[PDB]
Structures are given as structure tokens and as C-alpha cells.
Design a protein around this ligand. Sequence first.
Ligand SMILES: CN(C)c1ccc(C(=O)NCCCCCCC(=O)NO)cc1
Ligand SMILES: [K+]
Ligand SMILES: [K+]
Ligand SMILES: [Zn+2]
Length: 357
Amino acid sequence: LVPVYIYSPEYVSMCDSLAKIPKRASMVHSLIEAYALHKQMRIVKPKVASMEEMATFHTDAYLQHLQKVSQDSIEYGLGYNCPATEGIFDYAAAIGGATITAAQCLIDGMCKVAINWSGGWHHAKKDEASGFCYLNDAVLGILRLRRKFERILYVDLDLHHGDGVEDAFSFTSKVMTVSLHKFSPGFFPGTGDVSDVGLGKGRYYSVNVPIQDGIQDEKYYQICESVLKEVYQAFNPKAVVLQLGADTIAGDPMCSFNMTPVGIGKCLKYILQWQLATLILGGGGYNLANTARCWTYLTGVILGKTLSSEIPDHEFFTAYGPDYVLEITPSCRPDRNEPHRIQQILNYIKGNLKHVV
Ligand SMILES: CN(C)c1ccc(C(=O)NCCCCCCC(=O)NO)cc1
Ligand SMILES: [K+]
Ligand SMILES: [K+]
Ligand SMILES: [Zn+2]
């Protein structure tokens, strides 16, 4: 009954090697640990994903190519965004197996919530890398949950549209994907408008909520709670995979949304309250200190605790200036979401869900 935490020194050290988020893994860990939150969690060492576990989603041509490259390259999306970095195959296997490992505990009753903050790589296609994602651990995690669960719900709270995971299940009704991302022409990955609902046997089993800059905690929680309520109704899931990219939080260099760890928490609370199994994943988050602040605070609402406002002294204390507090103050930027558009969106979504059995 104690939340599982996927950690291991070798793992975190492996993740700190990710180009875009250097040392972000350590920062998140050490901050969560400096709050002694790991004392109230079942620490589980992550297992490396095997070539056959990754093959449950990715093609051999892709996986083998990714492997040879790990030692004509821009063939499988391995270009500007996803470079042919030496050792990526090993980094992705570690992160992928870290989610497979967390998924297994959920289908073992060993816990009702497993956490893998270093995961959440939602852009990767079965045979294509995208948006710094070489392997789609979110899909590998959901496919593992399918061993014991019939209806799995995937909620993507990342600033970006979880296309990789949506594409994976766009033709199926066994897994429903919900994504609240910023949608605007020329913004990555450019998909996910509200009209996007899935194909074939999976029509309407894909929900997309396009948002605009500036949105804040309450405006966001209303939209999220609203959509998550209608969804639990029609789909009535058995397990839940939650992607919590912190690139929505105020202060991120992404400078799009204007959330705080508490806005997301209200959403997290609302989902945890369904008492269904739950696989927590990180994702984007480009303001290192803030990301540790957000996920630590969230590892706090997962344990019903209320963390200390003053940031405990630790390994990376200095990176928490100039105030050294766990709270994030929203930026003074205008919300660009006209309330009428949010309604048209919510209705269109509402009428898209009636079609569910
Ligand atoms: C200043 N500089 C060198 C850059 C600035 C912006 C990008 C970018 O937006 N790239 C597009 C990829 C967006 C990240 C998607 C991964 C993600 O956040 N998933 O949730 C790249 C480089
Ligand atoms: K689907
Ligand atoms: K999203
Ligand atoms: Zn993102």
C-alpha cells in the first residue's frame, strides 16, 4: 500500500547523461530525498529493458539501427532533435525498462502507485525518434499494463501533445489517450487539435485539449477536472498512466503556460482519488530547479504530506536561488485563452465522448 519509487544510483546517474536535461535526474532525486519523502516509499531498483520488451512497440529495423548508432543516420528521425549520440540505445533501454519495471508492480498489487520521474518520453514512433525521444517508455509501460488491465487511461499533462502515444493507440479502444497541451501553428509537434479523435475502431478514443499561452492553475484545473470527469464516466478505466511534464510550470524557458506545481497537484489529486492503479511519469521540464520543485511537491501530494516551504539544504541548494522556496510564483503574462473558445472545446469534447459505448 506504499507508493513505489523507481530509483537506483546507477539509473539516476544514467539519466543525468541526457543532453537536454543535464543532472536534472539528480536534482529531482536529491530534492525529493532532502525532504525525506523516500522514507515513505517502496524504493524499487529499475530493470533494463530487453531487446524483446522494446520490440513490443518498436520495429527491429529501428531498434537495431538505434543500436548500431549507439556506438544515412537521419533515417529514423535521428536528426537535429534526436541526434545519433553515442550510447543512446543504452540510455533508452534503461529508461524504458524503468517504466516496464514500474508497470509490473502495479499488476502485482505490490503498490497502487509507481513513480518514474525520468520517464515520460511521449513523442517516439514505433520506427521513428522524435522530440528527443528514442524509445516510447510510456507506450511500453501501457503495453505491459495490458497484461492485466482491459481499459487503461493515459493522461498527458506535458506542455506538448503526446503524439507518439496517441498514434500507438489511435486505432484501438482498449487504451484511451487524453492530452492537455498547447496547440498553435509552428509549435511542436503541431498535432493534437480538438478535432483529432482517433481512427477506425478507436474513433473517439483519443481526446485532445488545445490550450494557448498564459493559462494558470484554476483556469487549468477547471478544464482538466471537467474533461477528466466526463472521461471516467464513459470509459471507466482500470489503470491510469499519468505523464507530468513540468514544462508547463511558470519559469520554464518554454514560456508558454503559466502553471505552478499546485495547479497540477489539484489534477493529480483528482485522479488519485479514483483509487485505480497509477503509473506516474515525468517528461519535459527545462528549468531544472523548478522541475525538481514541481515533482518533489507532487511526490508530496502523492504521500498526502505538506512539504516545508524553505528548501532544505542539500547537494544542489544553490540552484534554488534567489528565494530558496518550494513555491513557484506565476509570471506576469496575460492568459490568452478566451473563455468562449474553451467552452466550444469542452462541448465538442463532451459530444465526442457520448459515442463511447
Ligand atoms: C535555443 N535552442 C538551442 C532550442 C530552443 C527550442 C527548441 C525546441 O523547441 N525544440 C523542439 C522540441 C521540443 C521538445 C519536445 C520534448 C518534450 O518537451 N516533450 O514533452 C530546440 C532548441
Ligand atoms: K485510443
Ligand atoms: K500534453
Ligand atoms: Zn514537453
